[PDB]
Structure formats: structure tokens, C-alpha cells
Nucleic acid binder design. Structure first.
Ligand SMILES: [Zn+2]
Ligand SMILES: [Zn+2]
Ligand SMILES: [Zn+2]
Ligand SMILES: [Zn+2]
Length: 115
DNA sequence: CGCGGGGGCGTC
DNA sequence: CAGACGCCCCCGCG
């Protein structure tokens, strides 16, 4: 049993390899991490998750707009904002000829919902 | 109404 | 524990 499971607090061996691959599946949805913040007791399954959530407090804005020089807490958000300039709109309204385009997927969804 | 910003989740 | 990229979803605001 060289092998061991990575989940926190549940350290233990496993003779074979596949005999362990299957174990982890147990930890499938546990929330090992939490936020060491005042009254903000929120648990996160993944690590990058918590890391990110941190910024809500920290204030950090790790990403910056090459154009507006504006900083954002998330890359996906910046990614979008980048269209503020590019003027890209990959989402066309699927209704009869109401050929309106939107930069964000959901931005469209709300359009439809208004039709 | 366009877009900021936070959640959750699949994935290499 | 795999950090990091990418989306959908949903809400709030000027
Ligand atoms: Zn385990
Ligand atoms: Zn917190
Ligand atoms: Zn910009
Ligand atoms: Zn339309």
C-alpha cells in the first residue's frame, strides 16, 4: 500500500493503484477549505475556489485591462470587459430576424426573456 | 440595458 | 490535494 488519498484529514493507504482511484470518489463533494474571515463561514470544495473568494475581502485585483488599465478580480470578467472595446458580440438573438447581438451569453438570455 | 462582480462547475 | 482558463447563471446599479 504505497498509495494514499490526498483529501485533507483522510490520509490513508491503498495496496493497488486503481484500488485508490476509486476511493477518492468518496470525497467527491466534501468542502475541505473555509474562509478564515470574520463571520464569513463559507466552505469551498476546490482550492482555486477559496483563493478566488478571498479577493472579495482582500481587495486584490490580479488582472488588468491592457486598454483601460483597469484592474479586475477575475480573468473571466476581464475577458468579457475586453469586449467593451473589441465590440465583439458572439450571441445573436435566436428570435425571428430580431438579429441583435450581445457580448455576453446571459446578456442574450435576458434579451429573449424580454421578447 | 450594458456590464460589474460573486457562485458553481467541467477541464487540461 | 491542481493551479489556472473558461462558462453559465444570477443579481445589482447608474
Ligand atoms: Zn481519503
Ligand atoms: Zn470569506
Ligand atoms: Zn478596458
Ligand atoms: Zn431579439
Amino acid at each position: 500500500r504505497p498509495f494514499m488519498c490526498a483529501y485533507p484529514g483522510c490520509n490513508k493507504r491503498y495496496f493497488k493503484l486503481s484500488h485508490l482511484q476509486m476511493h477518492s470518489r468518496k470525497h467527491t463533494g466534501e468542502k475541505p477549505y473555509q474562509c478564515d474571515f470574520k463571520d464569513c463561514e463559507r466552505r469551498f470544495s476546490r482550492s482555486d475556489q477559496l483563493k478566488r473568494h478571498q479577493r472579495r475581502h482582500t481587495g486584490v485585483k490580479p488582472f488588468q485591462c491592457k486598454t483601460c488599465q483597469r484592474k479586475f478580480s477575475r480573468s473571466d470578467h476581464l475577458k468579457t470587459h475586453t469586449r467593451t472595446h473589441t465590440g465583439e458580440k458572439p450571441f445573436s438573438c435566436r428570435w425571428p430576424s430580431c438579429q441583435k447581438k450581445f457580448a455576453r451569453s446571459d446578456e442574450l438570455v435576458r434579451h429573449h426573456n424580454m421578447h
